[PDB]
Every structure is written in structure tokens, then in C-alpha cells.
Amino acid sequence: MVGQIAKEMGLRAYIVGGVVRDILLGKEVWDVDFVVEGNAIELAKELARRHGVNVHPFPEFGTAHLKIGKLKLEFATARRETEPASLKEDLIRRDFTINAMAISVNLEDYGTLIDYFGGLRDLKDKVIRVLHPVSFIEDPVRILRALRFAGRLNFKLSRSTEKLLKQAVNLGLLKEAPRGRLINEIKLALREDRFLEILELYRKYRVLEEIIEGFQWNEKVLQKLYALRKVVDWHALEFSEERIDYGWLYLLILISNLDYERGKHFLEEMSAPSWVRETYKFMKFKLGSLKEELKKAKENYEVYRLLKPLHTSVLLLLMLEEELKEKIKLYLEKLRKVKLPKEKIEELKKGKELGERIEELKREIMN
């Protein structure tokens, strides 16, 4: 209905950005970004009015948001910078060629993909390429983004883009960039399933050294990351109903050798979940003694007592040890699964003493 309203208003609207990319990548999303020549606000208001839904105008930004079903629609007036601006000017201010394309929703040309910079080719050639040499200097945050994209889509940086990125990092522009944008970029990164490769790119171009203070790369951490990769694979395979956020575990592995102050401060800046902070504070101190206790474990009930109160993250961190692996697994798919019939429990019940007795019965069954 967008093309119709755009025709009535004598306007030109286009689908724009990553939304197009995901479309060309076959990935359907519920968030659509529009660029409108002419007023986007009135377009959004009219579209929201016809479908009879609420509208959220932003006059100063020149954009408007409206939700139809599960579809989240954003209309944005064309602008040459972050006189009426052409679509091309609105596209050229963006980051990479694959994010620089557009698809026309106007009824006459409808279905047409508009690519000025050859983003279609780079998408076809699996290439992450900047629109202009000054791109990374304009927005240093993009330094992460590229890598992140190169992580997700398994693309490669062009020689140009790569040299420009290295030059950008060497200038220390990563420190000059706003802390919030970078931290948010990392938060976006860890949510990726391919985020490990993104970390490989972070190590390769050494951006984490700039972002995180006191952080350095070694082999033990990397091997820990790949071991954690395997553990995450298995856990998300068999136990997949129990899944949690995995990237935070990698993030914990990275900052493990860091001081507790810088770690707590970083997790503070990252707005990490509570279980993440707890798992970290537990890892830095009590984890060692916990492992030493698991080594002294003989009966299965001791393993129970030492494990069951812990979160899943702590267990997945305990699976990093070769000797404790099969033990953790044994606790997972077997040990903690059991029950009791009616009459027996009725005899068990005849306060906290009921719980103690039940514990005695469990340790009676195990061993």
C-alpha cells in the first residue's frame, strides 16, 4: 500500500540498507527501513491511518515509526548528511556497498533494485568494501562493524578497505570514538553465532587492545575460546532447550586474565546480565577452589551438592577441564534426573527436616 500512497502524494519511497541486504541474502526481517524523497512523516501518518494503527512521529529527526502486525516500519526523509536530498546522497553517507543499496516500492518501477556503488557485485563476491577512503575516519565505530559483518556473512575485506581500516586503528581513532557506540557494537557482536570469527578479526586487527584497557592476546585464552566453542556446540546440541546467551561466556574467557577492577568496570559499561556478573565474580575467585573440590570428589552426592546450586554458565566453564568434562556430563544427562512414587513419599513425610531426610534418601539412592 506504500507505493499507492506514495503515488497519491507524488513521492518516491525506497527500501534501504541492511534490510535490502538481508532480502538479497534471503533472510526475512520484521524491521523495514524506508527512505522517502519528500516528507516521510506524512507518509507514515497516512499509512498508519489507513491501517488504523498508532504512529510515532519524530519531526526533528525527520523520521517516523509505525507497527503493523509483526512488521516494524521506519520512514526516514532523505538526507545528504548525518535543499532536498536525492536518494543517492542518502545512500552514499552509509558504511559499506552491501548496505548502500535500495529497492523501489514505487508502483511504476516496483521491484527494482537500485545499486549505485556496485554493492550487488561485492555481495556476490563476498566483499566488505567502503564507499570512500575517509569512511573509517568519519565513523571509527565502523571499524568494528565491518569485522562484525565479515564475521557474520563470512565475507572478506577488500585490500583498499583493509588498508584503510589498519590505518584508522593505527591513528588511535578507536580511542577518540564515543565509548557507548563501541560498547554497543561489541554487544551486537557477542549476539552473533559466528561471533568467534569476529573475535578472530578483533585479534587480527588488534582493536580490543584499543577498546579494552590492559587486554592482551595469548594462546591459552584462544584455545579456551575454541574449547568453549566445542562445549557450546554440544550443549546447544543435546541440551538446546536449556540454552542461554553463549557470547557472554566468550567475553568472560577474554577478560579472565584481566584485573578484577577493569573486568567489573568493563562489565559495568557493557550492561551485562546479572548471571554474567555472578559467573565472573565466581570465576575469578571461588572457581579454583571449586575445581580442587571436584578433584577430591568420590561419591556422586558430593558432586551433586557442589554442582546443583550453580548456574549453567558455571558448569559450561567447568567443562573446559578435560578431567571434569565427563563428570559434568554425567551430572547433566543422568545424575540430577530422578523421582519417587506416592506411597513412599507419603511414608517419608510421616519443616526443613523433611528436606534433610529427602537429601539423605537421594544420597542413599546415588551411592
Place this chain on the structure above:
RNA sequence: GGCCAGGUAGCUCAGUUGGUAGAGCACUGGACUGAAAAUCCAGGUGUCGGCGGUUCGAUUCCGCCCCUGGCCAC
């Protein structure tokens, strides 16, 4: 949209190793009164946001959502 709190009676507020819930003023009833209030005995003072899951058992552990306030990314 991300996160941090906050969600406890009508209102204003505390509560951790999961194990049988609390204060200050309104609420009912009776004793009291010509009526009423005060006051005494007392006792409602609550599925401690909503829905699932784990657990013998969840205000607590976790997950998905509702609401309010604040940091932001917008």
C-alpha cells in the same frame, strides 16, 4: 530497542543459606453509645506483577511477557 533498579495490604515501606510472612493509618463484627467517635478484645489486613519450566515444594532459580522510573543507543 539494551540495561539497572523498583512491583509486598486501600496507601506509604523492610524481608536470601527454598521450609508454613510483617509495621504506621483505613475493613468487617461485637463489647461501649440516645446516635457517633475514641478506645479494648481482637482478628480480613496478601494466589508478595502475569504466564510456563526446574524442584517433593518457588516471593527466591531460570525463561517469556505486563507496568513504572531512570541511564542510554535512538
